[PDB]
Amino acid sequence: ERLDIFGVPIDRVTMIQAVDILNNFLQENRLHIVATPNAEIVMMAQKDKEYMEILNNTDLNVPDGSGIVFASKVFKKPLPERVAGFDLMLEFIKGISSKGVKIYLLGAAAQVAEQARANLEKLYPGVKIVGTHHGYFTEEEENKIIEEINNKGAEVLFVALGAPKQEKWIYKNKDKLKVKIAMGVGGSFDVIAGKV
Ligand SMILES: CC(=O)N[C@@H]1[C@@H](OP(=O)(O)OP(=O)(O)OC[C@H]2O[C@@H](n3ccc(=O)[nH]c3=O)[C@H](O)[C@@H]2O)O[C@H](CO)[C@@H](O)[C@@H]1O
Numbered sequence: 001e002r003l004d005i006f007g008v009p010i011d012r013v014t015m016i017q018a019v020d021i022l023n024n025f026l027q028e029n030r031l032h033i034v035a036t037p038n039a040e041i042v043m044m045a046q047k048d049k050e051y052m053e054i055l056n057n058t059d060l061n062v063p064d065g066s067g068i069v070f071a072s073k074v075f076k077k078p079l080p081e082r083v084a085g086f087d088l089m090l091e092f093i094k095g096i097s098s099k100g101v102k103i104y105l106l107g108a109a110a111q112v113a114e115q116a117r118a119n120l121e122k123l124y125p126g127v128k129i130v131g132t133h134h135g136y137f138t139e140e141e142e143n144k145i146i147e148e149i150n151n152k153g154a155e156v157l158f159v160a161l162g163a164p165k166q167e168k169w170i171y172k173n174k175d176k177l178k179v180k181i182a183m184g185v186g187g188s189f190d191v192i193a194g195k196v
Contacts, residue, residue, distance in 0.1 A: 003077075003079065007056075008041070008056075008061065009056060011060055011061055012077065012080060014080050014081050015081065015083050015087065015091060018083060022034065022060070022181060023096075026180050026181065028180070030180070031180065033058045033059055034183040035055060035060070035167050036184070037062075039068045041055075042068070051164045051167065054168060054171045057171070066082045085185065085188075089185050093120060093124050097125070097128075098126060101128065102153055102154045103129045103157075104132070104148075104152065104179070105131070105133075106157060106158070107166070108134060108135050108160050111134070112193050113133060113135070115194070116132075116193040131148050131154065135160060135161050146173060150176075150178040155180045155181065156179060156181045156183070157170075157177065157181065157183070158183055158189075159182060159186075160184075162186040163186055166184030170184060
């Protein structure tokens with residue numbers, strides 16, 4: 001089902017299979033960790049002993065970018081299509097925004113996460129974004145944020161802290177968090193807020 005690229009499992013999925021897998025994940029009552037690796041993450045994975053351990057315990061590693069698909073041309077069944085990890089995030093919010101699935105946005109510089117919430121509520125109307133918080137907090141604050149994420153009954157956590165911080169922060173709190181999908185989506189808040 002998956003492809004071993006220099007230690008990093010990449011699931012052989014299309015945009016639509018990846019959106020379908022993620023929809024079935026919301027139906028299973030456990031934390032799923034989704035990551036979107038590109039060639040640059042796989043190179044990071046070689047120097048970072050811990051990051052590699054993490055990329056092998058995620059529930060879904062979705063191939064981000066055209067470069068990593070190119071590398072797959074060495075394998076027997078190469079990766080089927082160009083998936084952009086940002087497109088995956090947006091096509092995903094399109095589908096759940098009618099069904100009222102609660103989304104929390106943790107990350108980005110001060111007031112950036114709040115602006116991305118606004119533009120999403122327009123593009124995908126009726127989307128339930130239950131909370132946000134900037135990506136610069138303390139160990140004291142972390143407990144407060146996680147408490148909010150859990151108590152507001154968020155099913156989807158979009159962590160925008162960049163690689164590999166986002167994938168590492170999720171894995172540490174993989175037992176504290178009570179959401180169904182926690183997906184590192186680094187820097188896509190900056191894009192949606194129009195800052196970048
Ligand atoms: C799609 C994806 O996985 N992209 C990654 C990329 O993301 P990026 O383009 O955003 O690059 P950064 O320079 O790391 O950006 C930092 C972002 O995280 C926020 N942040 C950071 C630190 C913090 O303590 N709190 C925060 O909130 C900040 O506001 C901003 O949104 O980074 C890697 C290296 O470049 C890439 O290899 C990798 O593909």
